[PDB]
């Protein structure tokens, strides 16, 4: 697990055991944005709802927003994601399977909108703690698209 903005917003891959969730708690994680698709979660845990219930059982508030591996969120999902991440400032954890592609993309987009950074700077900030963040052309194109419509996005988010 890594913090992009200390105790405010960080990223991670898909945990394998509950003990890893306890470590998240020790680091200050309070809320979790789950990005992998059902099958990806089932692949590791055996059942998607069981995994989500386990996050709740251990005192974390989860939101499941399924994004295809190597892909990006739809506009509807992104609005939902940004409102979720902004509704509660501290302890936000975003995770995918590897904690590099979808996670890096969301975290970078977050910085683009909240800190007014260019795509290059946003990815730079994420790669400082998570090397290789943002993997695909579509993910890169999504970020450029978000930067180009920052005003429109901020307008809809706030």
């Amino acid at each position: 697990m890594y913090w992009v903005r200390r105790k405010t917003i960080g990223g991670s891959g898909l945990p394998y055991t509950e003990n890893e969730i306890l470590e998240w708690r020790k680091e200050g994680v309070k809320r979790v944005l789950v990005l992998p698709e059902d099958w990806e979660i089932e692949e590791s845990w055996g059942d998607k709802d069981y995994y989500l219930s386990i996050l709740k059982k251990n005192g974390l508030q989860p939101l499941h927003i399924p994004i295809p591996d190597g892909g990006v969120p739809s506009d509807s999902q992104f609005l939902t994601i940004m409102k979720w991440l902004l509704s509660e400032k501290e302890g936000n954890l975003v995770h995918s399977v590897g904690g590099i592609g979808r996670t890096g993309t969301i975290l970078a987009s977050y910085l683009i909108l909240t800190e007014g950074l260019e795509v290059e700077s946003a990815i730079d900030e994420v790669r400082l703690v998570r090397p290789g963040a943002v993997q695909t052309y579509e993910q890169e194109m999504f970020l450029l698209r978000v930067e180009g419509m920052r005003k429109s996005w901020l307008k809809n988010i706030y």
């Binding site: 891959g13 399977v97 290789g132």
Partner: peptide
């Protein structure tokens, strides 16, 4: 995707 470095 393609994880495991």
């Amino acid at each position: 995707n393609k994880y495991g470095n």
